[model samples]
Target: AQYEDGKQYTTLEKPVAGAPQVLEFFSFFCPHCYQFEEVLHISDNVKKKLPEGVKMTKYHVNFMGGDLGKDLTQAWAVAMALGVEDKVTVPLFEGVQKTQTIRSASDIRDVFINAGIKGEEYDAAWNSFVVKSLVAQQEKAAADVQLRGVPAMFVNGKYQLNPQGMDTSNMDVFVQQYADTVKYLSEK
Candidate 1:
């Protein structure tokens, strides 16, 4: 994605091997992320719209919920570290969307373990690099952004600069538009 000078680009903590990468900061607790379940598949749709060599990673933000929240965040962490993120991420969102009950880091971890994600990868998960990385994401970078909410996106270098509030009922359409918006930014 091309960013003209003076524009603040999104800072992705993860090592991106390619250009036009999209960094998504999401939350299991947010209705937007929960509602995003309906259109999350649209990300692939968004991918089709992006330039070649572009990649995306959805980072779950959990600074407020403590260990349990971090646990759920660890689920994403584990999967990403293991390269199975695409496998469990949407299902993780699906599980929460269907329940509307409890959403946290720990709950997400249980879901991963139950989903058949196992071995030392999961067993060593606490000290896992993924977990450490996510902790740094929340504690050092994401929190100080003064982010008052979740489901925020940072593409290429630009943040959700043209920000629009997300509503629960319109999550499907919002995500689609959001994806398109990301696509638009990436193409430029």
Candidate 2:
């Protein structure tokens, strides 16, 4: 779901935001993130399969034992700032979840650079915008609710899906149930 330009973007953001907003908080290191990739990839279907006024966005939160918190967050914010969120989201998915090649900040930096991002552009974003933004959001999330774990899905800013912590036996079922809720929430 990569957008072309500001004029003709590849995909939509927060399709759920059209009516209700569904933001998926995930960590590429989480196995559940791998489990949800198929449905997450469903974002690419927004043009045809989705109902009117439905928007969705994916946010990578730190759940693993690593400093990728900064890297992943920076990638997303930078992509958004550069108007390449659609293109970068799946790359984040592939780079982190799909391939084991990325394990450090330098690895992350390379991905962005190789993908046509200017080094200065990404560095400035990492230093000025994404880091502080991620840290702030991290605190806000922590203070509000005790996180069960990563790969939590938030629907309409109200409903939360932390199935792994609550119901691991039917985790997949819970996930689809969560997605169904998003479908319901995002409907016009």
Candidate 3:
């Protein structure tokens, strides 16, 4: 990946525990984020190369309650709670990026249903207290990072940057550079 000034990442103030954590701040409705999925799918090798004990989490940013982005964000929380994130995240990304319309809650549910989530279980988890708490935690994490937009990456919860703007020739290079950055910071 290329940085015009060769600046890889900016130092963050707060110290982070849980060494080598990679927290991704993104929204399903975001077009750029839709493109960012390329990295998710193309970087399997980079994922394995990361140091051991490296934990990762993703936070969905919500800007409004009923807004498509916010609703999708909440839906992600439900998928996460159901432990179906690994299964549903890509399908949801494909569904929304393809259609670009999440006009209602049912629309959101359809994404899950297409991903094999049952209606009964979805309804139960969609707005449950646990889901709400998890969503709130994601929101708080975004706020803690002073999140200004979608597709932000924080290494170990401290250093933050955008992978899309890394100026790589391809997603593979981008992920390699990101893994290197995380490894460097983790050793500190």
Best prediction by TM-score: 3
Query: Distance from true position, residue 111, model 2, in Å?
Result: 0.6
> Model 1: what TM-score?
0.68
Ranking by lDDT: 3, 1, 2
State the lDDT of candidate 2 residue by residue for 78-184, as single tens digits: 66556666555556667777787788878877877878888998888777755576556644553344455766655565455433333335645554544454454
lDDT (10s digit) by residue, model 1, range 55-151: 8756667754566566666666666677777667666766666664446545665666776777555768756776787656644445535455676
TM-scores of the candidates are 0.68, 0.64, 0.83
Candidate 3, 78: how far from true, in Å? 0.5
lDDT of 3 at 45: 42
Candidate 3 per-residue lDDT, tens place, 36-88, comes to 66444423443566678766677788863347777877888898899887787
| TM-score of predicted structure 2 | 0.64
Scored by Cα lDDT, where does model 3 land? 0.70
Using TM-score as the yardstick, the better of models 2 and 3 is 3
Worst 10 residues of 2 by lDDT: 1-10
Clashes of 2: 11
lDDT of 2: 0.56
